[PDB]
Structures are given as structure tokens and as C-alpha cells.
Nucleic acid binder design. Structure first.
Ligand SMILES: [Mg+2]
Ligand SMILES: [Mg+2]
Ligand SMILES: [Mg+2]
Ligand SMILES: [Mg+2]
Ligand SMILES: [Mg+2]
Ligand SMILES: [Mg+2]
Ligand SMILES: [Mg+2]
Ligand SMILES: [Mg+2]
Ligand SMILES: [Mg+2]
Ligand SMILES: [Mg+2]
Ligand SMILES: [Mg+2]
Ligand SMILES: [Mg+2]
Ligand SMILES: [Mg+2]
Ligand SMILES: [Mg+2]
Ligand SMILES: [Mg+2]
Ligand SMILES: [Mg+2]
Ligand SMILES: [Mg+2]
Ligand SMILES: [Mg+2]
Ligand SMILES: [Mg+2]
Ligand SMILES: [Mg+2]
Ligand SMILES: [Mg+2]
Ligand SMILES: [Mg+2]
Ligand SMILES: [Mg+2]
Ligand SMILES: [Mg+2]
Ligand SMILES: [Mg+2]
Ligand SMILES: [Mg+2]
Ligand SMILES: [Mg+2]
Ligand SMILES: [Mg+2]
Ligand SMILES: [Mg+2]
Ligand SMILES: [Mg+2]
Ligand SMILES: [Mg+2]
Ligand SMILES: [Mg+2]
Ligand SMILES: [Mg+2]
Ligand SMILES: [Mg+2]
Ligand SMILES: [Mg+2]
Ligand SMILES: [Mg+2]
Ligand SMILES: [Mg+2]
Ligand SMILES: [Mg+2]
Ligand SMILES: [Mg+2]
Ligand SMILES: [Mg+2]
Ligand SMILES: [Mg+2]
Ligand SMILES: [Mg+2]
Ligand SMILES: [Mg+2]
Ligand SMILES: [Mg+2]
Ligand SMILES: [Mg+2]
Ligand SMILES: [Mg+2]
Ligand SMILES: [Mg+2]
Ligand SMILES: [Mg+2]
Ligand SMILES: [Mg+2]
Ligand SMILES: [Mg+2]
Ligand SMILES: [Mg+2]
Ligand SMILES: [Mg+2]
Ligand SMILES: [Mg+2]
Ligand SMILES: [Mg+2]
Ligand SMILES: [Mg+2]
Ligand SMILES: [Mg+2]
Ligand SMILES: [Mg+2]
Ligand SMILES: [Mg+2]
Ligand SMILES: [Mg+2]
Ligand SMILES: [Mg+2]
Ligand SMILES: [Mg+2]
Ligand SMILES: [Mg+2]
Ligand SMILES: [Mg+2]
Ligand SMILES: [Mg+2]
Ligand SMILES: [Mg+2]
Ligand SMILES: [Mg+2]
Ligand SMILES: [Mg+2]
Ligand SMILES: [Mg+2]
Ligand SMILES: [Mg+2]
Ligand SMILES: [Mg+2]
Ligand SMILES: [Mg+2]
Ligand SMILES: [Mg+2]
Ligand SMILES: [Mg+2]
Ligand SMILES: [Mg+2]
Ligand SMILES: [Mg+2]
Ligand SMILES: [Mg+2]
Ligand SMILES: [Mg+2]
Ligand SMILES: [Mg+2]
Ligand SMILES: [Mg+2]
Ligand SMILES: [Mg+2]
Ligand SMILES: [Mg+2]
Ligand SMILES: [Mg+2]
Ligand SMILES: [Mg+2]
Ligand SMILES: [Mg+2]
Ligand SMILES: [Mg+2]
Lengths: 129, 154, 205, 80, 122
RNA sequence: AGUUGGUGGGGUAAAGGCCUACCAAGGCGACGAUCCGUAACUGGUCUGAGAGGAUGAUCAGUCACACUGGAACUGAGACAC
RNA sequence: AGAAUAAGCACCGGCUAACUUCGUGCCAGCAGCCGCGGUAAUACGAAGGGUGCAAGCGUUAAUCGGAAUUACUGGGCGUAAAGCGCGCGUAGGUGGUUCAGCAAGUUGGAUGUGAAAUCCCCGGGCUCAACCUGGGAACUGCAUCCAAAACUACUGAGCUA
RNA sequence: ACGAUGUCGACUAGCCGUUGGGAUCGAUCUUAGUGGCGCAGCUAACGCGAUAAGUCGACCGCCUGGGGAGUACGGC
């Protein structure tokens, strides 16, 4: 019944990335917007736009580079059934730093690298590589 | 490349009017010890002929791997069929900590510190399939870093 | 304990030189060192990976005459250290007092140097040490007891050490039969055919 | 200074004493999921001014009866 | 199993029962031979196996196998038994130690004669 | 059913149903009470890449016991090896 | 003073390093699992040879590992074990989307404690080692204060997917 | 008591039918069912494939070698 909207966002991105599409549209929220922005800063997507009119729609344009999609493995970590939190010393590494893990901290939603840069841990949302 | 290693030799049979007909299957891996590697399977009515066929097949379809100085880039986890494979880079003093098909594949490929482990079935041909599926997808930097510049992605 | 018995059987079984005689005449013209010892010498008989690992470990053990328990101790301490336990093992095995005495040239073989050490004829830093396991530290000045310097064996072995290849990491003064152990040799200095990775693979199992 | 606790009144049928329930979240030692544990304390209420449902705060003092060693300091929310 | 399902009922370790219920956590136990007889193995094997029924100090009554070519066990012989199952004989879970109390071990044995209680020929 | 709380009093080196006389009908429990079986606890030990699993010889801390069941005296301290 | 006073145990078909003869013939026997023995037995019993350990060597009993074989890390349920015959619903678990607050969870910091011994690192002594010993690190925990507000929880007001 | 396939929600190429209902101009589109093929993907394989056995979430039920045995004893 959409008890996790972020998992729906990542599932939509993965499913339409596998299907060789160009734009993904979904209901938006101020958390999905932060996730989309942090992906944009990491070069995993082309662009994201938020619609107006009371029921905003968020649309994301994807990248392909070669014949294979740029995002090959995206996975949610902290679900509503588990709620995983980690400290600075325990922030997970995906592909030994070749990827990124999104972390929600009291300074906002950022990457694990920025998380150690500010020295603030938090909740591990998902891992992308 | 030319580094020949023999993994498994098995004897199979088919039933005919009259009795049983036996044949020999061989599995081999070839590589140059610096990044090229491939596997081959062969079947014949004698062991040497099957081994020769396996070598000839393995010398084709060799692929190029991206290794970070005699060691893998990042920990990796692959699978084929019902076989699961885990590998992770290790320090220089370490040997090759692996068993059977793992050891042959990795030693021929040129790596020396791999510290691997397999789950599920240990059927050698499926293990080799899984190991090359894992090794062929080693990304290495400057390729995953095609999105933007370098020294910021790491 | 210690291995006492035929010493050319070990060379034949391992298939290499494995210096165990004085080296005066030769090695080939005493034991026809191309057949494995025993009745079935002529058979080739290729051997599996476990056999190869076992042969390598046994070859190393048979060259320094160390038994299994002390070898386990050496391997454990080498693994506990830093920097590539494979070469740390040889670094450790080259610092034994009997091996050092053999390198300096006061003994024909390893067993003879061991008996020189055991029978109270070698002083490490000016006092007697009779343990053929004393780890010689770099800079130690090994010597011979003045009451035993005129033994024929030391003088006889001096020229044999004269023609065996310079170690180039120990020094010796012949008149006083006293030498200095500068430092433990690097992995390159030792014979680069002892593939210790087989030993590491065998023990990590 | 002095450490206190906060809970909700669940029983007031005794004379000059009340029962207060306190909730806490504990991480499961092995499975790592946060689960709710509860404590039922007996607090001393001298003037009988607490009703079922009142959100109150209490502090620890010397024992006043068997299984009664807490006394309440303030009522922060009143039952509707 | 889900995380909540596991919280409500965690995973349970199974216990492996010993194959030697008599001699409760003991290396060996002594007993008395209530009878010595001989029995026949299972299907693929054909032989005539020597077995002794032994009553232990526990009060248990079990059956032990007698190894070696000969033996001198009879009624009311005090014996020591150890673990070890004989595959061919059904119901035989123990072995009789040769040369311990009343068994005297085999004679004219010269190879591996420590599992049969035989002195060095000298 | 002294069971849970209150009051007066007694008692203790000291808070307290610890005890007593009245007043009330309370207290605990599927977050496992009660009952049955088993067992001194911990620092630690052994295994394992770790997470875990098994386990409390020797050494150190605490507890309980001193043929079996009770009781008190003397004493700063005992319900007394 | 003198070489005098001081080597044994298990195994050798595959797993697993190490092979041939002679006896016996579904017997006698062996055996951790596959299994050997019915007339050329590298598997039984001996002899020659060899392989592992070594003042020890084997067997038995017991724990963990391998076992991802109770799977948190880290398994499954069409046919191999495994979806209740089907609904409704209680305790519980989980919760679409905006503001604003609070600081229980969360994060960071400070302070107290976490006995010594033991394990780990750098050293010092016994001719070496075991052993003893100095300093450190660790003891991943608990408690109290300070700060933050992205997420969850709690409170007030909204919105319509 | 069977689709030998728990309920709920969201995504993912297409083609041919059919039962109810809508729109726009026999044609096109769109819903809620009911069938046949099939790309990716999945599976040990058979095969599944918008009526998933694919990609994911929330909660519940169940499994841990074959026999003994869905049996014995106890409760209801
Ligand atoms: Mg025909
Ligand atoms: Mg064929
Ligand atoms: Mg698998
Ligand atoms: Mg699978
Ligand atoms: Mg398996
Ligand atoms: Mg010893
Ligand atoms: Mg009391
Ligand atoms: Mg046994
Ligand atoms: Mg009364
Ligand atoms: Mg009172
Ligand atoms: Mg009073
Ligand atoms: Mg009173
Ligand atoms: Mg109970
Ligand atoms: Mg007891
Ligand atoms: Mg493990
Ligand atoms: Mg542990
Ligand atoms: Mg350990
Ligand atoms: Mg206990
Ligand atoms: Mg004691
Ligand atoms: Mg004590
Ligand atoms: Mg205490
Ligand atoms: Mg005490
Ligand atoms: Mg106490
Ligand atoms: Mg006491
Ligand atoms: Mg007594
Ligand atoms: Mg007594
Ligand atoms: Mg008494
Ligand atoms: Mg009295
Ligand atoms: Mg009196
Ligand atoms: Mg008194
Ligand atoms: Mg007492
Ligand atoms: Mg007394
Ligand atoms: Mg007493
Ligand atoms: Mg006492
Ligand atoms: Mg062999
Ligand atoms: Mg035998
Ligand atoms: Mg014969
Ligand atoms: Mg055998
Ligand atoms: Mg034999
Ligand atoms: Mg034995
Ligand atoms: Mg045992
Ligand atoms: Mg056991
Ligand atoms: Mg055992
Ligand atoms: Mg396990
Ligand atoms: Mg086991
Ligand atoms: Mg495992
Ligand atoms: Mg799991
Ligand atoms: Mg399974
Ligand atoms: Mg399910
Ligand atoms: Mg069936
Ligand atoms: Mg069902
Ligand atoms: Mg059903
Ligand atoms: Mg049902
Ligand atoms: Mg039900
Ligand atoms: Mg029902
Ligand atoms: Mg039924
Ligand atoms: Mg319902
Ligand atoms: Mg509810
Ligand atoms: Mg929400
Ligand atoms: Mg809720
Ligand atoms: Mg808010
Ligand atoms: Mg904190
Ligand atoms: Mg301490
Ligand atoms: Mg020292
Ligand atoms: Mg604030
Ligand atoms: Mg029907
Ligand atoms: Mg069914
Ligand atoms: Mg079935
Ligand atoms: Mg159903
Ligand atoms: Mg469903
Ligand atoms: Mg419904
Ligand atoms: Mg549904
Ligand atoms: Mg749905
Ligand atoms: Mg189809
Ligand atoms: Mg399936
Ligand atoms: Mg399958
Ligand atoms: Mg889930
Ligand atoms: Mg769930
Ligand atoms: Mg789910
Ligand atoms: Mg069973
Ligand atoms: Mg069974
Ligand atoms: Mg059973
Ligand atoms: Mg029945
Ligand atoms: Mg019964
Ligand atoms: Mg019944």
C-alpha cells in the first residue's frame, strides 16, 4: 500500500533503466527530491524536474554512456521494517569507494564521503554503483 | 597467452544396444598471467585428445580483465546456476586462499592475493562460469569515472 | 630430537642438491642422485598439489634439520610479524646459531656446525651459548673458544667455505677465527628457487 | 542535580499511591530491530491528584513501603 | 523467516545425540561378559563374527566386538570396552580393548601391534 | 488475604508489612506470572575471518555451605569451619 | 675417561604423502565413508621397501570449525521438505503528502566508571624458548551533562493521489 | 478443499481472441474480468513471463535427510 515511497522510487528508476527508457515520472516528496539532487551531483542521472500544481510530479532523465546503463546496482538499505543506523566509523563502503552510499544526517541528505568530511553519521538510505 | 592448467577430467557414458560407450571430458584454463584468461571444455574417446580439444577451445574466447596490481579492485560477489562466489582483495603477503577451480582460474589470470570462498554447489564448470562472470565485470577506475573527472569519484 | 641416518636418501627423494655432505668431491658420484630412494626408484610418478606442497615444506625442513614442532613455532612467529610471512620465514631460519656458524665457515655441514655449537665451542657476544636455536641479532660478533681454535675441523672447513660462493653479508677474521654478522640476508640473497608460497599455502589449511 | 522519569498513569485505585507505566525502545541484541519494553512503577502521591491517563513525572527516593520507592514531582498532562 | 517472525520466535539449535549411550561421556568402561557367542554379518558380507554381551558398571547391557584372530574370553570375564561401531553387525556399538584386564591381546602379531595389546617381540 | 495500600503503635544501627490493631480491596500476569526440570555467578577459557557457538578446571572477585534439622548467646563484627 | 649410557609408534586402494612379493581362498579377517576377501589380494596376516611424526606415537570420549546444514551478517516454500480449505477480525507490526514545534530513537563532543590478571604492541631479565616482568593499547558497555534537526517517534494545523 | 503458487500495493517490449461498460470518428482509444503466444528477466530443468514463478516493499503462515509417524501419551 506504498508503505515505503523511496523503495518505489528506486524500483522505478531501476525498472525503467533496464527497459532502455529516457524519463521516469513519479509522485514527488521533499525526500525523493533530496535523493534526486544528490544523484545529480554524482553524475548518475541527467537531470530532474519537479512539477507545480498541488500534486507535483517529479521526472528524471537517465544516462546510458555506453551500450550499458550508468546505474547498474542500486539497493535500498534502511527499510521501514529494519531502520538501520550507523556511526561515522561504521559507514559502509560499496565497491571499496568506487560507488556511493546515501546517508541522511542532521546536516541533510548527502554522500558517505561528505559524511566523513563533516564527521557526522546517520541513517543509511541506499547504495548506488 | 600460454599458461596451461588442467582442472577436471571426468568419464561419462551413453547406453546403446549392446552396452555402454565411454567418453572423457576435460576442463582447462589458459592465460598469460597478466590479465588474459579463458576456459575450455573438451570431449573425446581418449584423455589426451579431450585435453587437446579443451586447450584449443580455451585458447579462443580469451577475455581481458582489469586488475589493480596483482590484486582485485573491490570485493565482489558473483553467481552462476546454483553456485555463488565471493572474492576480495588481500594484502601482498597473502597467498591465494581458494580451493579447486578458484585456485586454477585466479592463478592463471595472474592475481596472487584473492582470498575467495564459494557457496552452494561446487560443480567445477559452474564455479568457473561464476568466477569469470565476476572477473569480467571488474570495472576499475577511469571507466566508472567516465561520468566526470578523476580524483573526486574516489 | 634430531634426524640421524642416511643423508643421500633425502637428496634423492627431494631431487635437488640439498647440501648435506662436506661437498669435497661431488654429489653425483656417491648416490646416483636421479632415482627416488627404495625399490621403485625408476618410476616417475607425478604427484598432486598436496604432494607438491608437502615436498617443498619437507625440503626446507631437511635443509636446516628442524623438526615439525619448531617449524610450526617459526611459522607462527613469522605470521605474527609484519611484511610477507613467506619471506619472514626464511629471514627467521637464517638467523639460527648453527646456520650462522655454518655460513661463517667453521663447519663442513650443518650438523657439524650444530655439534660445534652444542659442545661449548662457540661464544656469541663473548659468552658461551650452546643452544643451536639462539637467534643471532645483527651486529653480534660470533667467535670460537680459544681452547678449541686449533681443532682440525675448523681449519679444514675454512677453505671449503673459501670456495662455495661468497655470502656477502657476514665477515670473518681468519687469524682469530672471529666474525661479525652484519644483518640477516635479504630474500634475493638466498637461493631463489625455494618457493615459500607453497609452504604458506600448505599451512593456511 | 536529580534524575527523573516520565510516564503515564495506569492505575490509581490505591490510597496515596499510583501506578505509572514507562515506555522504552531497546535494540534487539542479535536481530537489530528496535522493540518496545515497558516498566510499571509505584509512585507516592500524597494528596491524590492523579487520574488514569495523566502524563506525570517522578523521582527516586528512599523506600516508603515494600515495592514503593518513587514519588511524583509534577503533573505535565491531565486526562481529558 | 521475517525479522519480526524471528523476534517472536528465534532460530533453534538442534542437539546431536551420542552414538554411544552407555559409557556416559567416558573414554572406556569395564563390564562383565554375560555370554560369548558368534554371529553373522549383513547381506553383502559373509563371515562368522565374534561378539560378547557385556553388563557394565552403569547397569547397561550392550554388545561388544572382539578384534584379532584369537581370544580367551569366557563367562564372567572382566573386560574393558571403548567406542566404535561395527558396520556389518546390527546392534554392535562398542569394541573390546585387547590386553587391558582379561583379554591378553593377540599373539604372533608383529605389525601394528598396539591396537591389539601385543608386546614388542624383542 | 499480611496478600496490595493507609493510619496509630511496636521493633531495628538504619528505610520498610519487618511486626501488630483497625480501614480499604487491592497487587502480579501472553513484554510469560505461577508451576515443572536443570544450574553457584562473573573476570575469563576454547573454537571461529568475523558475527556467533560451546563452556565456568587451574588464577582473581562475589555468594552459599561446614554429619542432618532448629535456636540463640558472647562479641566492634557470627547465627560461628 | 671414553662413542662409550640413551628410538620408538602409526600408516602405504581413493579421499591422503608412501608398493612389490609370500601365505589364505565369502574362511581367517579388515573397516572413518566408499567398501576389500569366492586361486596371481598394492585393502586380511607376514617379509623387504617407503611415508609421516618423534620421547613420543596411536585409539577412545568430548567442543567448535568445515555446515550458507536454524542462513542477523547469510537459506528457502509451482514439481525436491515447506502457502493454513476460505473469509472477518482482537493484541501486535507497518504508514500517502505539506507546514510548525519537541528532542524519546539517531548523530557528535565532554566527564565518571568499565578491578587486577589474561589476550594484542613496543621493550627488559633467565645462555635461547617456555616463563617472569615495565609501559601502552584494548575492555566494542553503562551513566550524566552540552549541541544538531535530515529521518523515525510525539503534538498542533493542513491537503486529496 | 489444486493454479499442488498467502493477502495487499507499485513498476516492466509486443501480437491474437473473448465477457460486461464506456468514449472519439465499421475504425481508434480506455477500464474491469477470462484465454492463447512471446522480448528482456528468472529458474536445476521443466517452465513462468502485466492473471510473474521478473524488479521491489508491508505483514502473516510454514520447512530443516528417509522410515518410525501425522503415530503414541496428555489436553481440547
Ligand atoms: Mg532401434
Ligand atoms: Mg559423446
Ligand atoms: Mg545460488
Ligand atoms: Mg537461485
Ligand atoms: Mg550443497
Ligand atoms: Mg619435544
Ligand atoms: Mg523489603
Ligand atoms: Mg568412532
Ligand atoms: Mg492484619
Ligand atoms: Mg506509611
Ligand atoms: Mg512507624
Ligand atoms: Mg503500620
Ligand atoms: Mg514460564
Ligand atoms: Mg547443583
Ligand atoms: Mg563460519
Ligand atoms: Mg568468540
Ligand atoms: Mg581467536
Ligand atoms: Mg552457566
Ligand atoms: Mg577447585
Ligand atoms: Mg574470592
Ligand atoms: Mg558484589
Ligand atoms: Mg568471598
Ligand atoms: Mg554482594
Ligand atoms: Mg557465607
Ligand atoms: Mg566438613
Ligand atoms: Mg563427610
Ligand atoms: Mg547445624
Ligand atoms: Mg542459646
Ligand atoms: Mg544462653
Ligand atoms: Mg550484642
Ligand atoms: Mg556464616
Ligand atoms: Mg567459628
Ligand atoms: Mg555453622
Ligand atoms: Mg569462610
Ligand atoms: Mg597417493
Ligand atoms: Mg591395517
Ligand atoms: Mg595370492
Ligand atoms: Mg587403507
Ligand atoms: Mg596388509
Ligand atoms: Mg593405537
Ligand atoms: Mg576421538
Ligand atoms: Mg563428539
Ligand atoms: Mg571426534
Ligand atoms: Mg552455522
Ligand atoms: Mg561434525
Ligand atoms: Mg561457510
Ligand atoms: Mg535471512
Ligand atoms: Mg536449502
Ligand atoms: Mg512467503
Ligand atoms: Mg511427491
Ligand atoms: Mg494459505
Ligand atoms: Mg490456497
Ligand atoms: Mg487460510
Ligand atoms: Mg489462525
Ligand atoms: Mg481462521
Ligand atoms: Mg488438509
Ligand atoms: Mg483482515
Ligand atoms: Mg491496530
Ligand atoms: Mg510518512
Ligand atoms: Mg503506529
Ligand atoms: Mg517535519
Ligand atoms: Mg550519545
Ligand atoms: Mg581489566
Ligand atoms: Mg631475552
Ligand atoms: Mg533545538
Ligand atoms: Mg472444486
Ligand atoms: Mg497444500
Ligand atoms: Mg510436494
Ligand atoms: Mg488464501
Ligand atoms: Mg500475491
Ligand atoms: Mg480485503
Ligand atoms: Mg494483490
Ligand atoms: Mg495490485
Ligand atoms: Mg508464453
Ligand atoms: Mg523457482
Ligand atoms: Mg529450482
Ligand atoms: Mg523486506
Ligand atoms: Mg515484510
Ligand atoms: Mg514483502
Ligand atoms: Mg527425521
Ligand atoms: Mg533419523
Ligand atoms: Mg528421526
Ligand atoms: Mg491422530
Ligand atoms: Mg512412545
Ligand atoms: Mg488424542
Amino acid at each position: 500500500s506504498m508503505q515505503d515511497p523511496l523503495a518505489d522510487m528506486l524500483t522505478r528508476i531501476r525498472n525503467a533503466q533496464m527497459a532502455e527508457k529516457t524519463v521516469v515520472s513519479m509522485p514527488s516528496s521533499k525526500l525523493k527530491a533530496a535523493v534526486a539532487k544528490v544523484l545529480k551531483d554524482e553524475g548518475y542521472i541527467a537531470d530532474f524536474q519537479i512539477s507545480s500544481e498541488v500534486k507535483p510530479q517529479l521526472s528524471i532523465e537517465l544516462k546510458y554512456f555506453e551500450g550499458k546503463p550508468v546505474i547498474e546496482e542500486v539497493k535500498r538499505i534502511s527499510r521501514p521494517g529494519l531502520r538501520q543506523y550507523k556511526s561515522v566509523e561504521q559507514l559502509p563502503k560499496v565497491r571499496g569507494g568506487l560507488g556511493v552510499s546515501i546517508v541522511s544526517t542532521n546536516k541533510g541528505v548527502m554522500t558517505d564521503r561528505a559524511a566523513r568530511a563533516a564527521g557526522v553519521g546517520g541513517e543509511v538510505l541506499c547504495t548506488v554503483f | 597467452g600460454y599458461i596451461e592448467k588442467l582442472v577436471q577430467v571426468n568419464r561419462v557414458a551413453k547406453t546403446v544396444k549392446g552396452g555402454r560407450i565411454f567418453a572423457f571430458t576435460a576442463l582447462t584454463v589458459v592465460g598469460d598471467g597478466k590479465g588474459r584468461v579463458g576456459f575450455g571444455r573438451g570431449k573425446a574417446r581418449e584423455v589426451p585428445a579431450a585435453i587437446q580439444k579443451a586447450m584449443e577451445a580455451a585458447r579462443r574466447n580469451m577475455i581481458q580483465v582489469d586488475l589493480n596490481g596483482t590484486t582485485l579492485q573491490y570485493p565482489t560477489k558473483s553467481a552462476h546456476g546454483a553456485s555463488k562466489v565471493y572474492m576480495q582483495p588481500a594484502s601482498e603477503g597473502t597467498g591465494i586462499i581458494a580451493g579447486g577451480a578458484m585456485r586454477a582460474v585466479l592463478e592463471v589470470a595472474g592475481v596472487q592475493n584473492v582470498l575467495a570462498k564459494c557457496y552452494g554447489s561446487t560443480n567445477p564448470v559452474n564455479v568457473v562460469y561464476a568466477t569469470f562472470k565476476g572477473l569480467k565485470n571488474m570495472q576499475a577506475p577511469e571507466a566508472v569515472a567516465a561520468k566526470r573527472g578523476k580524483s573526486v569519484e574516489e | 630430537a634430531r634426524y640421524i641416518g642416511p643423508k643421500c636418501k633425502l637428496s634423492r627423494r627431494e631431487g635437488t642438491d640439498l647440501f648435506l655432505k662436506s661437498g669435497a668431491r661431488a654429489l653425483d658420484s656417491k648416490c646416483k642422485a636421479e632415482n627416488v630412494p627404495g625399490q621403485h626408484g625408476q618410476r616417475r610418478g607425478r604427484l598432486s598439489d598436496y604432494g607438491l606442497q608437502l615436498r617443498e615444506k619437507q625440503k626446507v625442513r631437511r635443509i636446516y634439520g628442524v623438526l615439525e614442532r619448531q617449524f610450526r613455532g617459526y611459522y607462527q612467529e613469522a605470521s605474527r610479524r609484519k611484511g610477507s610471512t613467506g619471506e619472514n620465514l626464511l629471514q627467521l631460519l637464517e638467523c639460527r646459531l648453527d646456520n650462522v656458524v655454518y655460513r661463517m665457515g667453521f663447519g663442513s655441514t650443518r650438523s657439524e656446525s650444530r655439534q660445534l655449537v652444542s659442545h661449548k665451542a662457540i661464544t656469541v657476544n663473548g659468552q658461551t651459548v650452546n643452544i643451536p636455536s639462539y637467534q643471532v641479532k645483527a651486529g653480534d660478533v660470533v667467535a670460537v673458544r680459544e681452547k678449541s681454535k686449533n681443532q682440525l675441523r675448523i681449519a679444514q672447513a675454512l677453505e671449503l667455505c673459501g670456495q662455495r660462493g661468497r655470502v656477502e653479508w657476514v665477515e670473518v677474521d681468519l687469524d682469530k677465527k672471529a666474525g661479525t654478522f652484519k644483518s640477516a640476508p635479504a630474500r634475493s640473497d638466498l637461493s631463489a628457487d625455494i618457493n615459500e608460497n607453497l609452504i604458506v599455502e600448505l599451512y593456511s589449511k | 542535580t536529580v534524575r527523573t522519569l516520565t510516564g503515564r498513569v495506569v492505575s490509581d485505585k490505591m490510597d496515596k499511591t499510583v501506578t505509572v507505566l514507562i515506555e522504552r525502545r531497546v535494540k534487539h541484541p542479535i536481530y537489530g530491530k528496535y522493540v518496545k519494553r515497558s516498566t510499571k512503577l509505584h509512585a507516592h502521591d500524597e494528596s491524590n491528584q492523579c487520574r488514569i491517563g495523566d502524563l506525570v513525572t517522578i523521582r527516586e527516593t528512599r523506600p516508603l513501603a515494600k515495592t514503593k520507592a518513587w514519588t511524583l514531582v509534577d503533573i505535565v498532562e491531565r486526562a481529558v | 523467516a521475517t525479522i519480526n517472525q524471528l523476534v517472536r520466535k528465534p532460530r533453534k539449535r538442534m542437539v546431536d545425540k551420542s552414538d554411544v549411550p552407555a559409557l556416559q561421556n567416558c573414554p572406556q568402561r569395564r563390564g562383565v561378559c554375560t555370554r560369548v557367542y558368534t554371529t553373522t554379518p549383513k547381506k553383502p558380507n559373509s563371515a562368522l563374527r565374534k561378539v560378547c554381551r557385556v553388563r557394565l558398571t552403569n547397569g547397561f547391557e550392550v554388545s561388544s566386538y572382539i578384534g584379532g584372530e584369537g581370544h580367551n574370553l569366557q563367562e564372567h570375564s572382566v573386560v574393558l570396552i571403548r567406542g566404535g561401531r561395527v558396520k556389518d553387525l546390527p546392534g554392535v556399538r562398542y569394541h573390546t580393548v585387547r590386553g587391558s584386564l582379561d583379554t591378553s591381546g593377540v599373539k604372533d602379531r608383529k605389525q601394528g601391534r598396539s591396537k591389539y595389546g601385543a608386546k614388542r617381540p624383542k
